[PDB]
């Protein structure tokens, strides 16, 4: 009855870095970087990383390595009353599996369609393009008027998404069968990557987490060699210290770092719960976080060296080219850039392969975190049939992802992307931090870390765990709850009932912790004071 330790330390390191670096690093980081300063956004980014990001990452890595019980059942040794964090994380994982794998299916569809001598998003001659189409890079003879479109945007919104057949979340109509097949392939790959446990998932990661870096290096070389990349990099790094004063830039930096490291999802607990007890978690936490941050920086460089090239081609400012916010920056913008590259039909393939692989390992990590939590919590029914319950998890994830594959499924992608994993995960991480620091002793936790590694964490880590880190998490959550979003994917301003539905998604994930607190308080006997005292201390079997 021993845990299946990692085959090598490199297995754990590569798994964690593959989890941390995801599709968000590619479109979200450069986007939020230029929107809030450029090189002036790198001062708040690193400050938030040092003060709130690394502490949580390291804390939960050490916690998982010491208690080594996953997410649901690890609270039996920290603070039993907070066992609802595991179920909240399970629900959040359900939503993330609903939308993330659909995005990966879009990437796979692009990769499959990019096996032709002429890429299908180059001209408007196709049968999906409308009368608003005009070549993006053609001469000024064809002006952009006020409502002109580009071949790649129509390829993305009328052929791949078929968003034009749906008129919002009101009629989430039909289902693209091509995207269904693509997501089925994605899910079979996912299942066969993690079905046997960590032994096989640590060896699949060897490629799935290192291949994106090779593709990023080649793409960066190409973008640097492009004419006009200097515009892009200069617009990416040119600091705007005036933008620093507003609290919005710091808010965005803190949120970006927290969601990039991805603590509080129960997956770092699952990963750290496998490597040896005496393994060094401080060093690997530091190196993994540094690698993740540098990867975000280099991915932003890759994106902007091409954004500036495209802006130079049209003789326009780089600001007028990057207004594409989310995945449109990769499926419309970078697709247009690739279509005009000299050796096209090869950069498209590697670009979409990097996208699919760097999403594939974040999916592996999340699903493995959920699986580890459930297996640890219920070893009497599961943990004998490791093959099973991963088939069930993948099947339910696919079923929940079916609504995201409909014709109006990109709207659901964006609704889940903003509300699922919103103030729900942030509150979960805050509750975990308070449960490990305040409720569970901090002197006790540092004693555990000392017994595990060999030295007690320094005063900086202690202060960050106690006050600064939960304070920053609360500052991020308070930011989100004040501003209601104004989602707008493709000329579709979302309705108010959609905002209410998103708030309901947020409530559903977080309506596990309070209900479990109430249930646990009811179950235990004695007066209220002793009822909470008993429910607060670890069981200590």
């Amino acid at each position: 009855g021993e845990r299946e330790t990692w085959g090598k330390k490199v297995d754990f390191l590569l798994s964690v870095i593959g989890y941390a670096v995801d599709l968000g690093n590619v479109w979200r980081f450069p986007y939020i970087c230029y929107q809030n300063g450029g090189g002036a956004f790198l001062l708040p980014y690193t400050i938030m990383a040092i003060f709130g990001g690394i502490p949580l990452f390291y804390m939960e890595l050490a916690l998982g390595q010491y208690h080594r019980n996953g997410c649901i059942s690890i609270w039996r040794k920290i603070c039993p009353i907070f066992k609802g964090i595991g179920y909240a994380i399970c629900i959040i994982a359900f939503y993330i599996a609903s939308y993330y794998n659909t995005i990966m299916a879009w990437a796979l569809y692009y990769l499959i369609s990019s096996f032709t001598d002429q890429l299908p998003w180059t001209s408007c001659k196709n049968s999906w393009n409308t009368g608003n189409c005009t070549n993006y890079f053609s001469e000024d003879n064809i002006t952009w008027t006020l409502h002109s479109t580009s071949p790649a945007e129509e390829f993305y919104t009328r052929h791949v998404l078929q968003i034009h057949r749906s008129k919002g979340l009101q009629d989430l109509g039909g289902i693209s069968w091509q995207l269904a097949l693509c997501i089925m392939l994605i899910f079979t790959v996912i299942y066969f990557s993690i079905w046997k446990g960590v032994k096989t998932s640590g060896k699949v990661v060897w490629v799935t987490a290192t291949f994106p870096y090779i593709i990023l290096s080649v793409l960066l070389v190409r973008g640097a060699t492009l004419p006009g990349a200097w515009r892009g990099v200069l617009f990416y790094l040119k600091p705007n210290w005036q933008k620093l004063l507003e609290t919005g830039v710091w808010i965005d930096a803190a949120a970006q770092i927290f969601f990039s490291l991805g603590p509080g999802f129960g997956v770092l607990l699952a990963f750290a719960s496998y490597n040896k007890f005496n393994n060094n978690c401080y060093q690997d936490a530091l190196v993994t976080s540094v690698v993740n941050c540098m990867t975000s920086f280099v991915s932003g460089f890759v994106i902007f060296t091409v954004l500036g090239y495209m802006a130079e081609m049209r003789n326009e400012d780089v600001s007028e080219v990057a207004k594409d916010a989310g995945p449109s920056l990769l499926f419309i913008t970078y697709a247009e850039a690739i279509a005009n590259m000299p050796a096209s039909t090869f950069f498209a393939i590697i670009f979409f392969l990097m996208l699919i692989t760097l999403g594939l390992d974040s999916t592996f990590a999340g699903l493995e975190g959920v699986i580890t939590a459930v297996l640890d919590e219920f070893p009497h029914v599961w943990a004998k049939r490791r093959e099973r319950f991963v088939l069930a998890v993948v099947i339910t994830c696919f079923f929940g992802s079916l609504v995201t594959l409909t014709f109006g499924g990109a709207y659901v992608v964006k609704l889940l992307e903003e509300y699922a994993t919103g103030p729900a995960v942030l509150t979960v991480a805050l509750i975990e931090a308070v449960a490990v620091s305040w409720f569970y002793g901090i002197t006790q936790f540092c004693r555990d870390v000392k017994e595990m590694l060999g030295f007690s964490p320094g005063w900086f880590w202690r202060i960050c765990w106690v006050a600064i880190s939960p304070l920053f998490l609360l500052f991020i959550i308070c930011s989100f709850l004040m501003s209601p979003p104004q989602l707008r994917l493709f000329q579709y301003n979302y309705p108010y009932w959609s905002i209410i539905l998103g708030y309901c998604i947020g409530t559903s994930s977080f309506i596990c912790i309070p209900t479990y607190i109430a249930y646990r308080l009811i179950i235990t006997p004695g007066t209220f004071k002793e009822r909470i005292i008993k429910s607060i201390t670890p069981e200590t079997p």
Epitope: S123, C124, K125, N126, S127, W128, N129, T130, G131, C133, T134, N135, I142, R158, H159, Q162, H164, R165
Partner: antibody, heavy 118, light 110 residues
Framework: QVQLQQSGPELVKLGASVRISCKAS????????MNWVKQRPGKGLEWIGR????????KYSGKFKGKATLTADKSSSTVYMQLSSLTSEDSAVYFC??????????????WGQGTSVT | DIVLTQSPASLAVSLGQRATISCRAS??????????LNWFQQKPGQPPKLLIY???NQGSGVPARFSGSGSGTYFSLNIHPMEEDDTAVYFC?????????FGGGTKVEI
Amino acid sequence: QVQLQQSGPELVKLGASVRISCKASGYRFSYSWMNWVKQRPGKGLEWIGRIYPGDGDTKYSGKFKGKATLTADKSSSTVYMQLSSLTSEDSAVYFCARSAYGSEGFAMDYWGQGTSVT
Amino acid sequence: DIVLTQSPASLAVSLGQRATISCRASESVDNYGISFLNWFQQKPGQPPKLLIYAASNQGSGVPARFSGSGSGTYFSLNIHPMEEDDTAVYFCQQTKGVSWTFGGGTKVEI
């Protein structure tokens, strides 16, 4: 206003060739397919081929793959169509039509008056 | 290469009676929600004047009389009560596939 004008009638010699042109105006010709359809006397329409000026892409039916070749000229806004090995079967009226955009069902909105080769 | 067959090759419809012309595509002409099937009308010795596009949308400068319906593989061109000035030949063209093909044609007459 969109109007397509094409050359006048020609003569059909066995084993000869002709050069039927279709000047276009009133729209951005470089973003619409330019179809050709044959009309035998006393018969129905018969699609011949396609051409997309701006890209040069051309499609043909399974009867004119070698008989007819389409060409475009972005300077003069004219689309040509060369016919080779003129038999008495291909003496007909060739119309130069202009397809709509993909969303409009590629409907051939505007037609030329038709060039009769006899 | 989708073969289109127009069942009523001849319409002897009198004034005031609507004329129904059918089309039959071997394969489905629909794609991205747009039935790729236009209807044309050709007077004796005149270029084919477009009538319907997308099998349902009205042409340009065409009377409301001419109405197209149907989706998938079966399409119709239900011409509201006919009159003397529209006794022509109506063709059924599909614009889905590498090679677009016309229909057999359907002459109409009193």
